[PDB]
Design an enzyme around this catalytic site. Structure first.
Site, PDB file in Angstrom:
ATOM      1  N   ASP A  76       0.787  -1.129  -0.044  1.00  0.00           N
ATOM      2  CA  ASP A  76       0.175   0.037   0.108  1.00  0.00           C
ATOM      3  C   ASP A  76       0.814   1.281  -0.062  1.00  0.00           C
ATOM      4  OD1 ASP A  76      -1.872   1.977   0.541  1.00  0.00           O
ATOM      5  OD2 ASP A  76      -3.023   0.797   1.980  1.00  0.00           O
ATOM      6  N   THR A  77       0.955   1.807  -1.240  1.00  0.00           N
ATOM      7  CA  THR A  77       1.750   3.003  -1.479  1.00  0.00           C
ATOM      8  C   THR A  77       1.337   4.287  -0.554  1.00  0.00           C
ATOM      9  OG1 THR A  77       0.830   3.454  -3.652  1.00  0.00           O
ATOM     10  CG2 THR A  77       2.809   2.256  -3.334  1.00  0.00           C
ATOM     11  N   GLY A  78       0.005   4.093  -0.408  1.00  0.00           N
ATOM     12  CA  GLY A  78      -0.709   5.594   0.351  1.00  0.00           C
ATOM     13  C   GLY A  78      -0.720   5.333   1.954  1.00  0.00           C
TER      14      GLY A  78
HETATM   15  N1  DMQ Z   1     -11.752   1.797  -1.105  1.00  0.00           N
HETATM   16  C1  DMQ Z   1     -10.855   2.705  -0.293  1.00  0.00           C
HETATM   17  C2  DMQ Z   1     -10.461   3.883  -1.079  1.00  0.00           C
HETATM   18  C3  DMQ Z   1      -9.697   4.653  -0.806  1.00  0.00           C
HETATM   19  C4  DMQ Z   1      -9.225   4.466   0.844  1.00  0.00           C
HETATM   20  C5  DMQ Z   1      -9.719   3.280   1.738  1.00  0.00           C
HETATM   21  C6  DMQ Z   1      -9.077   3.092   2.893  1.00  0.00           C
HETATM   22  N2  DMQ Z   1      -7.779   3.341   3.022  1.00  0.00           N
HETATM   23  C7  DMQ Z   1      -7.378   3.846   4.426  1.00  0.00           C
HETATM   24  O1  DMQ Z   1      -8.270   3.963   4.991  1.00  0.00           O
HETATM   25  N3  DMQ Z   1      -5.921   4.215   4.444  1.00  0.00           N
HETATM   26  C8  DMQ Z   1      -5.740   4.640   5.676  1.00  0.00           C
HETATM   27  C9  DMQ Z   1      -4.350   4.334   6.622  1.00  0.00           C
HETATM   28  C10 DMQ Z   1      -3.925   2.784   6.218  1.00  0.00           C
HETATM   29  C11 DMQ Z   1      -2.842   2.365   6.891  1.00  0.00           C
HETATM   30  C12 DMQ Z   1      -1.975   3.087   7.305  1.00  0.00           C
HETATM   31  C13 DMQ Z   1      -2.273   4.596   7.500  1.00  0.00           C
HETATM   32  N4  DMQ Z   1      -1.264   5.747   8.153  1.00  0.00           N
HETATM   33  C14 DMQ Z   1      -3.487   5.083   7.072  1.00  0.00           C
HETATM   34  C15 DMQ Z   1      -5.219   4.479   3.429  1.00  0.00           C
HETATM   35  C16 DMQ Z   1      -5.415   6.034   2.710  1.00  0.00           C
HETATM   36  C17 DMQ Z   1      -5.286   7.053   3.616  1.00  0.00           C
HETATM   37  C18 DMQ Z   1      -6.330   7.714   4.338  1.00  0.00           C
HETATM   38  C19 DMQ Z   1      -6.403   8.803   5.189  1.00  0.00           C
HETATM   39  C20 DMQ Z   1      -5.109   9.376   5.316  1.00  0.00           C
HETATM   40  C21 DMQ Z   1      -3.901   8.755   4.736  1.00  0.00           C
HETATM   41  C22 DMQ Z   1      -4.067   7.563   3.904  1.00  0.00           C
HETATM   42  C23 DMQ Z   1      -4.480   3.512   2.709  1.00  0.00           C
HETATM   43  O2  DMQ Z   1      -3.485   3.978   1.936  1.00  0.00           O
HETATM   44  C24 DMQ Z   1      -5.671   3.189   1.562  1.00  0.00           C
HETATM   45  O3  DMQ Z   1      -5.254   2.205   0.528  1.00  0.00           O
HETATM   46  C25 DMQ Z   1      -6.742   2.400   2.199  1.00  0.00           C
HETATM   47  C26 DMQ Z   1      -6.434   1.009   2.985  1.00  0.00           C
HETATM   48  C27 DMQ Z   1      -7.565  -0.023   3.474  1.00  0.00           C
HETATM   49  C28 DMQ Z   1      -8.012  -0.066   4.670  1.00  0.00           C
HETATM   50  C29 DMQ Z   1      -9.226  -0.931   4.696  1.00  0.00           C
HETATM   51  C30 DMQ Z   1      -9.952  -1.691   3.741  1.00  0.00           C
HETATM   52  C31 DMQ Z   1      -9.503  -1.445   2.362  1.00  0.00           C
HETATM   53  C32 DMQ Z   1      -8.094  -0.589   2.239  1.00  0.00           C
HETATM   54  C33 DMQ Z   1     -10.526   2.506   0.843  1.00  0.00           C
END
Ligand code: DMQ
EC number: 3.4.23.16
Lengths: 99, 99
Positions: A25-27
């Site tokens: 997960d690059t984000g």
């Molecule tokens: N469908 C969808 C679209 C967009 C975002 C998400 C939900 N996500 C997050 O909640 N994240 C918080 C996350 C995940 C892990 C670590 C951290 N620090 C934050 C970040 C995105 C992000 C949000 C807020 C601030 C910064 C980044 C991550 O990079 C994303 O891939 C997913 C990871 C994920 C979690 C649960 C189920 C599926 C996928 C889902």
């Protein structure tokens, strides 16, 4: 390997003797895993995501194998839906994003 | 180009005649952007993240230019704290992951 994004970029990891799958997960700045037993001490932390915040407990210096690659770092274990490998570890396995 | 993951992988997008930055996000299935004005109609949906679920508006058939590449897709607009370009558009611009 090179991975295209038509499917979830899922990988096998070994942590603490257990085998899991996790999403590259690059984000994500951090790695966070669903609840699993880790030995050792941990400190509470909270992280934000889309959706709000979760309370998490932080372990440092945890060895992980991701594919064959070993790395050591911080992992947050917590109530996530999915196990996420974040940029802290992706840098160690040399992962790059390319277009 | 190639992006390493020592810093967050942000890109400029042009969406709805407005210029934004967003995060290239391999873990996200969908593109989710903060509240903004897009023309047209949209359906409500909810998505799950970490921390829980948010309600968003779905637009279909939207043009976005991501680092200069054009793409058309569904964008969800809603209360995210960061703009996220997920796999549905990442695929259209030929983004790969590699290690
Ligand atoms: N469908 C969808 C679209 C967009 C975002 C998400 C939900 N996500 C997050 O909640 N994240 C918080 C996350 C995940 C892990 C670590 C951290 N620090 C934050 C970040 C995105 C992000 C949000 C807020 C601030 C910064 C980044 C991550 O990079 C994303 O891939 C997913 C990871 C994920 C979690 C649960 C189920 C599926 C996928 C889902």
């Amino acid at each position: 390997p090179q991975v295209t994004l038509w499917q979830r970029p899922l990988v096998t990891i070994k942590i603490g003797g257990q085998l899991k799958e996790a999403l590259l997960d690059t984000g994500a700045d951090d790695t966070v895993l669903e609840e699993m037993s880790l030995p050792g001490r941990w400190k509470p932390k909270m992280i934000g995501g889309i959706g709000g915040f979760i309370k998490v407990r932080q372990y440092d210096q945890i060895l992980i194998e991701i594919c064959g690659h070993k790395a050591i770092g911080t992992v947050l274990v917590g109530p996530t839906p999915v196990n996420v490998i974040g940029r802290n570890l992706l840098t160690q396995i040399g992962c790059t994003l390319n277009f």
